[PDB]
Design a protein around this ligand. Structure first.
Ligand SMILES: Nc1ncnc2c1ncn2[C@@H]1O[C@H](COP(=O)(O)OP(=O)(O)NP(=O)(O)O)[C@@H](O)[C@H]1O
Ligand SMILES: Nc1ncnc2c1ncn2[C@@H]1O[C@H](COP(=O)(O)OP(=O)(O)O)[C@@H](O)[C@H]1O
Ligand SMILES: [Mg+2]
Ligand SMILES: [Mg+2]
Ligand SMILES: [Mg+2]
Lengths: 139, 739, 7, 372
């Protein structure tokens, strides 16, 4: 990261500071990385965080200076498509099946996140053009 | 390897024979597995085994226990448990065998609408139900004009009567309807009364094989029924081990003695008589044996035993008990004589219409004739007792055969069977804390049936391998024949036992010593217990079983002196007594020899026929409806040989899938050419699978491994999407966070 | 026999 | 399946039958007849020689040969006729299809058992066979593993002690006294009363007299004093022609020679002293258990009173503190056959048979080492 990047990233970090002390929680570090263009797994986020315990994850606060090496560490299309073709081979995906797998397998999300991301992408049959949905979620 | 973080294994436990644990850190090849349990525990990996894996949840709960990609005791126990408790499904298929769990409570499934729904259905398309056995036997008889059998195996008290009842109801209804089922079901009260005894585990243990033939005309309309019986346990009549009773009828007859009609028999307190006395246990709890006889006599009436015949039978059985009370005084080591005016004999002779002074002679002498001459000669007190006890066993087994023929007279038809179907109720493999000649006979019979079963299964799999054109050489027969040879060959345990009967001064010590000299290091299946010289161990298919020798030369002896039979045939007082005998080597055959012959008449009656197997298991002791206990279940699954049958099938190619089904499951990994590549892509050992015309055949492990890599592929794809979607939503929420 | 007796 | 034949050659009666049944079904005398007279009628079906029951039907015109004298087979060619008649005519069973069990007295020339084996393999093609000692078989027949067997048939008498199924070879006694020699003495004492039986047919008539009328006096001397002093013993018997002959003290006096072979001039003492002298050749730990069982076997023992005479005079010989028990089942005439019937049906015995394989390998010499 260059000086301009470091300044923009620090500003973004401060936007996530909900207490005014210039810090975020451990649990926000991943969110900041994702807002900054990273796509870390929850496991990767905890690893760069040092596998924190529940208590410090929920209440311990860290400033930008400790986050930055973590962002660096995380930082340092055809698979995405095949990954969606997993849940298909006519280029569609059931809305019920995608909802079930996203809320019940892997790093399970909430029903509201899945409804939000899936909103407007499924048709009347309950099929999602996943190539279009993928372009949408990658923009 | 197969053991990874987020693997699942069964750990052995006394609380339940297995319980599930989770593999908390990956194993690598050494001496601890880090396990997690329903919380921390550590489990030594110890010389040797590894703990068995757990089937994935696609497979768990399926109707057919051979669709499991690991085949071992806990997996089966779990599938039966969940199907029974969670579905309330009792019936299940294991391979060809139906497993049928006793609920202790009536269920709605049996109604005629279901009978109709099962008509014309192939077994496999149906959810398993006993109507699937009945139907596929009935329609095999219709297809192919060979008789069919049904075989029902287990501990008694697991409902074998009910499985018979619903099978013959099925036959009645899909035929249409001779009122056979009513008369057949009216047989059970008497055939239990004569047929059943308490046993150390159980009440109402049936001690004899029972066979029902349902005959059909050329229309496949029910003609009529015929009953046969085999393998009767004759030795129980004269001798019981502690905490057992004689056949129920004797105690029903004794407790009846208060009734005026039975006044003349002079039946005493049930502990008055030597054949009732010995078990030391006159009264079963939860039974009124006086009230039972009111049922028995009614079933006799309503099968057409005349009022005259009932009082004949109860005369004969009073005869047997009084005969048992007869006592001999030895007058010399060679010679014995009945005390003058000994009252038991007086009563037996009065009951039975014979002279006192003829029986007093013939009980105490035996006669031999050359062609020219005859000699009457005395016999020892031991031979006189063995003769009396053989006479009682011969009367009882002739009475039992007469009652069966007088039932067939009530069930036979003028129209003769063009073909029949047969239903066999038989005792399973048996083991108790003591083992004795009865348990040896039962276990030998089951080893013969388990041979027949393994032969029939090997037939069917040879057919299925030709249909799919997979060569038989890749499967092998598992043969229990060495264990049969150990028992019934020349110089086998039964052969040396019959030898040691006729041998002079034969004793259970010299018998055991002959066993050890003959077999002890000659045969793999025979072993001596380390601390005892009076016992020996046979490795049967189900288990190792330790037998005591101490009984067998009492029980194996049978000989009857034709003189005494000719005294009884002479009787004028009533018709039944000479009627029994009417129909010369057999008088000399031992019980072990008569048993082995009856077992051949059975094995030919089933080799005549095509079998179908049902197994029944009794999941708890307190008759609690829809409760299941692993510690009974594991016993009874083993006593039914199901767990060997599973082990053998696991030595085969137990899981087989059609191409559509596989392709539909595993496109995520990626028509016949397609899968033919995909298996070479995913499996390095070609031995692990075979191709066929419509099917693929897998060695036991493979399908769970394929499910595992499928789940991992799906996991990776899911997590890639999950992280990227959540991250985009976080970039959107970032703009929310500004806003 | 052969010696000490007739048979 | 297949069942052994069991044969006892004996002298006098041959008795044979199938293993595992109660009594022999072929019992007939071991006697061979040849005609001696001119044959007059042409067209009779004249027949060279007769065997068994036929020879005693026609005995008036026949010389009767016994082929076995003192348990030795003296004439082989006439022995083979007896065996051939036994298997084909009496049992009607072909010997190729059945093992065969054969019976012999101890202490007799080995050439006899060799040639008896050779005939069974070479002429009858018997699949397997064995030769057993009559004494041993009497114990199987009476249900003991321990006793001293006193056995006397026609021909040879022998004692064998057995203790827990071990024989004691050095104690075996053999005596030629029993059997025919009682009859050849009886014919001499009957000559004193003016009847003369010379022919081999008359010998068989005396053999029937002996079986009907002889008995053993408990005290010999008082019964001679009595039958001298009275006719009250006297009994009379009807010959085949309807003559009647009457017999007094001779009828006890003949079996008495079993206890005093001095009467006929034999060298050595009677069966009580050979039984006692046999027990005295046994080590002192077992004598109590031989005295407790004495098993009498074979037909000569059948004379009424012989058991009580034995038991009395051995109790005179033995030390007084012991029980002498004499065991004489009424069936004892058959005991050797019944015991062979038991033995041949034991499963353990199926290794004992001499098979044809071993005979062809090693020749008839095998009998001595494989058999006792
Ligand atoms: N499959 C079943 N369905 C319904 N009730 C059952 C079933 N199995 C057992 N029972 C009941 O449980 C009890 C035991 O079964 P039952 O048929 O009486 O065995 P049984 O008479 O002992 N046959 P057997 O053991 O061969 O003598 C009875 O009260 C039955 O009604
Ligand atoms: N009841 C009898 N009383 C006395 N002697 C008998 C009796 N029966 C047979 N004998 C004699 O016993 C001899 C036959 O004995 P047996 O045992 O048949 O001979 P073997 O030992 O050869 O079979 C003949 O001398 C016969 O006369
Ligand atoms: Mg029943
Ligand atoms: Mg019942
Ligand atoms: Mg003899």
């Amino acid at each position: 990261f260059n000086k301009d990047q470091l300044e923009e990233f620090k500003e973004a970090f401060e936007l996530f500071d909900r207490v005014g002390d210039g810090k975020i929680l451990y649990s926000q570090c991943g969110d900041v990385m994702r807002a900054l263009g990273q796509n870390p797994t929850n496991a990767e986020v905890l690893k760069v965080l040092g596998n924190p315990k529940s208590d410090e994850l929920k209440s311990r606060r860290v400033d930008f200076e400790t986050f930055l090496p973590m962002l660096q560490a995380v930082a340092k299309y055809e698979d995405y498509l095949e990954g969606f073709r997993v849940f298909d081979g006519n280029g569609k995906v059931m809305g019920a099946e995608l909802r079930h797998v996203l809320t019940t397998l892997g790093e399970k999300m909430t029903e509201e996140e899945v409804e939000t991301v899936l909103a407007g992408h499924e048709d009347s049959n309950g099929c999602i053009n996943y190539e279009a949905f993928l372009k949408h979620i990658l923009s | 390897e197969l053991y990874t973080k987020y693997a699942r294994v069964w750990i052995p436990d006394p609380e339940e024979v297995w319980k599930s644990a989770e593999l908390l850190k990956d194993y690598k090849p050494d001496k601890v597995l880090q396990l997690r349990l329903e919380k921390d525990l550590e489990y030594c990996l110890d010389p040797k085994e590894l703990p068995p894996l757990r089937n994935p949840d696609i497979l768990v709960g399926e109707n057919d226990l051979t669709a499991l990609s690991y085949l071992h005791e806990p997996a089966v126990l779990h599938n039966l448990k969940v199907r029974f408790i969670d579905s309330k499904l009792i019936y299940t298929y294991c391979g060809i065998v139906l497993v049928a769990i006793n609920p202790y409570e009536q269920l709605p499934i049996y109604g005629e609408d279901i009978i109709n729904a099962y008509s014309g259905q192939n077994m496999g398309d149906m959810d398993p139900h006993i109507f699937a056995v009945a139907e596929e036997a009935y329609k095999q008889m219709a297809r192919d004009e060979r008789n069919q059998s049904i075989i029902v195996s287990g501990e008694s008290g697991a409902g074998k009567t009910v499985s018979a009842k619903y099978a013959m109801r099925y036959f009645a209804t899909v035929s249409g309807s001779a009122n056979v089922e009513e008369k057949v079901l009216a047989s059970n009260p008497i055939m239990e009364s004569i047929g059943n005894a308490k046993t150390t585990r159980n009440d109402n243990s049936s001690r004899f094989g029972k066979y029902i033939e349902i005959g059909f005309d050329k229309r496949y309309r029910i003609i009529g029924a015929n009953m046969r019986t085999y393998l009767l346990e004759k030795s129980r009549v004269v001798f019981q081990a502690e905490e057992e009773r004689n056949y129920h009828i004797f105690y029903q007859l004794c407790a009846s003695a208060a009734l005026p009609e039975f006044k003349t028999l002079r039946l005493g307190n049930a502990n008055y008589f030597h054949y009732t006395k010995q078990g030391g246990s006159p009264v079963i709890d939860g039974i009124d044996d006086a009230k039972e006889m009111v049922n028995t006599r009614q079933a006799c009436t309503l099968l057409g035993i005349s009022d005259s015949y009932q009082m004949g039978i109860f005369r004969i059985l009073a005869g047997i008990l009084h005969l048992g009370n007869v006592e001999f005084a030895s007058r010399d080591s060679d010679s014995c004589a009945i005390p003058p005016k000994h009252d038991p004999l007086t009563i037996f002779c009065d009951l039975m219409g014979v002279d006192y002074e003829e029986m007093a002679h013939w009980l105490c002498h035996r006669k031999l004739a050359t062609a020219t001459e005859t000699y009457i000669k005395p016999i020892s007190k031991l031979h006189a007792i063995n003769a009396r006890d053989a006479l009682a066993k011969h009367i009882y087994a002739n009475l039992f055969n007469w009652i069966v023929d007088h039932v067939n007279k009530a069930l036979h038809s003028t129209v003769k069977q063009h073909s029949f179907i047969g239903v066999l109720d038989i005792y399973g493999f048996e083991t108790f804390e003591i083992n004795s000649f009865e348990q040896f006979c039962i276990n030998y019979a089951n080893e013969k049936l388990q041979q027949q079963f393994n032969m029939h299964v090997f037939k069917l799999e040879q057919e299925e391998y030709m249909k799919e054109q997979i060569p038989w050489t890749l499967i092998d027969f598992y043969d229990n024949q060495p264990c049969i040879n150990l028992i019934e060959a020349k110089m086998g345990v039964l052969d040396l036992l019959d030898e040691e009967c006729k041998m002079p001064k034969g004793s259970d010590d010299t018998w055991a010593q002959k066993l050890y000299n003959t077999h002890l290091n000659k045969c793999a299946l025979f072993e001596k217990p380390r601390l005892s010289n009076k016992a020996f161990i046979i490795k049967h298919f189900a288990d190792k079983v330790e037998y005591q020798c101490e009984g067998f030369l009492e029980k194996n002896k049978d000989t009857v002196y034709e003189e005494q039979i000719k005294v009884l045939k002479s009787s004028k007082k009533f018709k039944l007594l000479p009627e029994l005998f009417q129909d010369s080597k057999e008088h000399k055959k031992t019980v072990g020899h008569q048993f082995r012959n009856s077992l051949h008449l059975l094995m030919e009656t089933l080799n005549a026929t095509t079998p179908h197997y049902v197994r029944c298991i009794k999941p708890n002791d307190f008759k609690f409806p829809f409760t299941f206990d692993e510690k009974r279940a594991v016993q009874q699954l083993r006593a039914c040989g199901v767990l060997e049958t599973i082990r053998i099938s696991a030595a085969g190619f137990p899981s087989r899938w059609t191409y559509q089904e596989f392709f539909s499951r595993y496109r995520v990994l990626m028509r016949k050419q397609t899968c033919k590549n995909v298996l070479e892509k995913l499996i390095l050992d070609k031995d692990k699978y075979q191709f066929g015309k419509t099917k693929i055949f897998f060695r036991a492990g493979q399908v769970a491994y394929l499910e595992k890599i499928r789940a991992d592929k799906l996991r990776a794809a899911c997590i890639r999407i999950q992280k990227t979607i959540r991250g985009w939503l976080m970039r959107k929420k970032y703009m929310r966070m500004r806003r | 026999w052969x010696a000490x007796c007739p048979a | 399946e297949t069942t052994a034949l069991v044969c006892d050659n004996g002298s006098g009666l041959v008795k044979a039958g199938f293993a595992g049944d109660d009594a022999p079904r072929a019992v007939f005398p071991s006697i061979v007849g040849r005609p001696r007279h001119q044959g007059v009628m042409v067209g009779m079906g004249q027949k060279d020689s007769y065997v068994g029951d036929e020879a005693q039907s026609k005995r008036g015109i026949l010389t009767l040969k016994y082929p076995i004298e003192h348990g030795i087979i003296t004439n082989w060619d006439d022995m083979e006729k007896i065996w051939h008649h036994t298997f084909y005519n009496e049992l009607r069973v072909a010997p190729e299809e059945h093992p065969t069990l054969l019976t012999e007295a101890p202490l007799n020339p080995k050439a006899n058992r060799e040639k008896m084996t050779q005939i069974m393999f070479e002429t009858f093609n018997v699949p397997a066979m064995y030769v057993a000692i009559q004494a041993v078989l009497s114990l199987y027949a009476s249900g003991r593993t321990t006793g001293i067997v006193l056995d006397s048939g026609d021909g040879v008498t022998h004692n064998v002690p057995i203790y827990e199924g071990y024989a004691l070879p050095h104690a075996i006694m053999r005596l030629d006294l029993a059997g025919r020699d009682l009859t050849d003495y009886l014919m001499k004492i009957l000559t004193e009363r003016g009847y003369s039986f010379v022919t081999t047919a008359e010998r068989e008539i005396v053999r029937d007299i002996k079986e009907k009328l002889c008995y053993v006096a408990l005290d010999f001397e008082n019964e001679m004093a009595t039958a001298a002093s009275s006719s009250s013993l006297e009994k009379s018997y009807e010959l085949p022609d309807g003559q009647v002959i009457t017999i007094g003290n001779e009828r006890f006096r003949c079996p008495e020679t079993l206890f005093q072979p001095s009467f006929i001039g034999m060298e050595s003492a009677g069966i009580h002293e050979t039984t006692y002298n046999s027990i005295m050749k046994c080590d002192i730990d077992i004598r109590k258990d031989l005295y407790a069982n004495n098993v009498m076997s074979g037909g000569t023992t059948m004379y009424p009173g012989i058991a009580d005479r034995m038991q009395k005079e051995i109790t005179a010989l033995a030390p007084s503190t012991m029980k002498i028990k004499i065991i004489a089942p009424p069936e004892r005439k058959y005991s050797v056959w019944i015991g062979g019937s038991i033995l041949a049906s034991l499963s353990t015995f199926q290794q004992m048979w001499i098979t044809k394989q071993e005979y062809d390998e090693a020749g008839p010499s095998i009998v001595h080492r494989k058999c006792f």
